[PDB]
Design an enzyme around this catalytic site. Structure first.
Site, short mmCIF file in Angstrom:
data_model
loop_
_atom_site.label_atom_id
_atom_site.label_comp_id
_atom_site.label_asym_id
_atom_site.label_seq_id
_atom_site.Cartn_x
_atom_site.Cartn_y
_atom_site.Cartn_z
N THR C 154 -37.88 3.01 -4.53
CA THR C 154 -37.95 2.76 -6.01
C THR C 154 -39.13 3.63 -6.55
OG1 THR C 154 -36.60 1.12 -6.00
CG2 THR C 154 -37.66 1.72 -7.99
N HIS C 206 -37.92 -12.49 3.27
CA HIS C 206 -38.81 -13.35 4.14
C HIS C 206 -37.81 -13.90 5.22
CE1 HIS C 206 -42.31 -16.25 3.98
NE2 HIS C 206 -42.41 -15.40 5.02
#
Lengths: 233, 233, 233, 141
Positions: C154, C206
């Site tokens: 992005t 995570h």
């Protein structure tokens, strides 16, 4: 006996704070933009008028300029004045500029609101800001003074710090965090010079405001803070 | 045939990791404070005692100083020693200083705990830290050595990196992340000089600790790390 | 009458955006790593070939180099090519390099995908990137062109900005954010010099990728971007 | 009663000049009048008697609590006075734009009658034609 621990009840204040925080945490995906503004002219400008403000009983801080810069951004990028409720026919666009100023007090997080910030000059804002800050500190705010913001500014800078990640008060779409001002080496033109920089952190609700829009709004603010004369006119 | 993909089962280790992570993700709104410390004196101090530590079989790293700085902050700002469970009468304040040191291993994320860190000198901590790190690496930790922390420190700096956003282990209220140390141009007094800076990232649970308090705790740590002699006394 | 507000319906586009965003927000705990790359050689290299690209009808930007650097990282650290669904036997490892390029358009957030990015040269990528960008801008993308990415990049940098916190598209495990390039004083060897730096922000899930692994992947990217010749070979 | 006096405008001239290009980019022509309008609002606030009006009956002393400023113009239709309402809430660029728009409407006779009403005070420019120290007639209300 060992590794002592003391138990306390959450019901006094902590439960009230958590009740609000546990909603804000899953309201929306939040995105923060961390950036910096060159505030050399801002510092010089505030300094120039410091004595004048003192004569009038007004203490200048940088916040009144931040408030004006935010109003300007809110006007240029009107999506920032919106709010969203949870029903489908709930996209609300405000046509006024009410700015909340957050404060961390012994009563939790309070946000006095300066209404019609778009119609006030710098000295007037400095005076209103200081008055609201005192009312917040003592718990003397009228509940109607804590309502109606289109956007909120959170200062962490008074405690030091850079680039924090403020929580958007859930009814709104964005919050602007303000860090400390400190000199850093920068490169200006062809030279390495030091200049005061302001750490900025803009947090927005991804369901309504995209990356490019939020950054453009931030760029608007950065340009105005770096040159107060254009901000005033 | 094309765009090949291999399927694997989550049940070996991934499911166990996810079971914990999927709870931590919605435990609380988390706020991170990104900042930097000038560690010129810290670097010089550790260097001075590097040979001595080597003679004693001790490897010095900066972590033992970070551990002492954290204990000091935990003492000055006692809210950091608290923990919260989900029932109302569950605000717990610890009266001891147990510090977890996170490690990324092949068994997932382990956190050995140095108990009574407040009563240890730098050489002793360096020795304990190195021993716990080896036990964690080999999976030789006793489960009771992974319990009882009031706070945790996560080092990412050994892998490089700055300003990460650590997850607060859900039973506690804050985690301190440590980045790399690297020289950067800074402005010191009237001159632009280079000096080693340590990237710091403090993450806290917004339901209990506000912005100003967390920043003050961080400022405490920054001041001590920048001058080890005051930290030791 | 006063403090006017206009009501609008969420059902046109906002509801569709929110439907996706409200899932991504609680998909996983996300961690972002903020760091910087020295891109002096990258800038010089792109400049050198700017005229050539123009002759061929190709506009060079830095993105094609970022795409190659990402492919290399994806290969060295294969966990980044994985994806996760919610059932237990859903850990999927891709054996191809499909890279999405995000774009903010009037139709919301679109992500065209360059398939088999591993087999393309820089000029070819620059041409494909520009074509996909135009198709995205006009809504001319075939739905199959928005599918199959192993990872997404992005760019916020085209709007200015540093260190943002991109949302990982939920089916994948990581997203790489690219900020602006700007000169900053740096210390190089024994001197303070200015050099263009690229702000990088890596966001990862995570539950699958730990801190050390993500930072190592980022370090890989930083090393390659700082020296394009090694990236090309 | 007329008071004839002079102001040192060295800084005003320099300031307007500095922002002339910016205004031009935005489609705004700066003149000095927007500064005069702001200075007048400030005076009206400090010396509130200036916001009053008087009718002929005894219980007719009226004090306004707003700052509406008329700008006089000499046109082929006689003397027109468009009014900038709530002048106290506008910045310089905004006033310059409103002033220029009202001036054009006055010139062409395109003013809505409600735009010529409600002033607390009026400013008359003679300066565009040259001149010093004239003796303006107070619009009787």
């Amino acid at each position: 006996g060992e590794f002592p621990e003391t138990r306390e009840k959450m019901s006094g204040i902590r439960r009230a704070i958590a009740k609000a925080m546990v909603h804000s945490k899953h309201t929306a995906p939040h995105v923060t933009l961390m950036d910096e503004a060159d505030v050399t002219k801002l510092v010089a400008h505030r300094k120039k008028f410091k004595a004048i403000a003192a004569e009038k009983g007004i203490k200048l801080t940088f916040l009144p300029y931040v408030v004006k810069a935010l109003v300007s951004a809110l006007r240029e990028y009107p999506v920032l004045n919106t709010s969203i409720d949870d029903e489908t026919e709930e996209i609300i666009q405000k046509h006024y500029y009410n700015i909340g100023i957050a404060a961390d007090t012994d009563r939790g997080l309070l946000v006095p609101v300066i209404k019609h910030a778009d119609r006030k000059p710098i000295f007037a804002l400095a005076q209103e800001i200081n008055e609201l800050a005192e009312k917040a500190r003592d718990g003397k705010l009228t509940p109607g003074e804590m309502k109606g913001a289109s956007c909120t500014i959170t200062n962490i800078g008074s405690a030091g710090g850079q680039w924090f990640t403020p929580v958007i008060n859930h009814p709104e779409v964005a919050i602007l965090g303000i860090g400390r001002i400190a000199e850093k080496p920068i490169v200006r033109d062809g030279e390495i010079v030091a200049a005061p920089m302001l750490a900025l952190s803009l947090s927005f609700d991804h369901r309504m405001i995209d990356g490019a829009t939020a950054q453009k709004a931030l760029n608007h603010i950065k340009r105005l803070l770096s040159d107060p004369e254009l901000l005033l006119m």
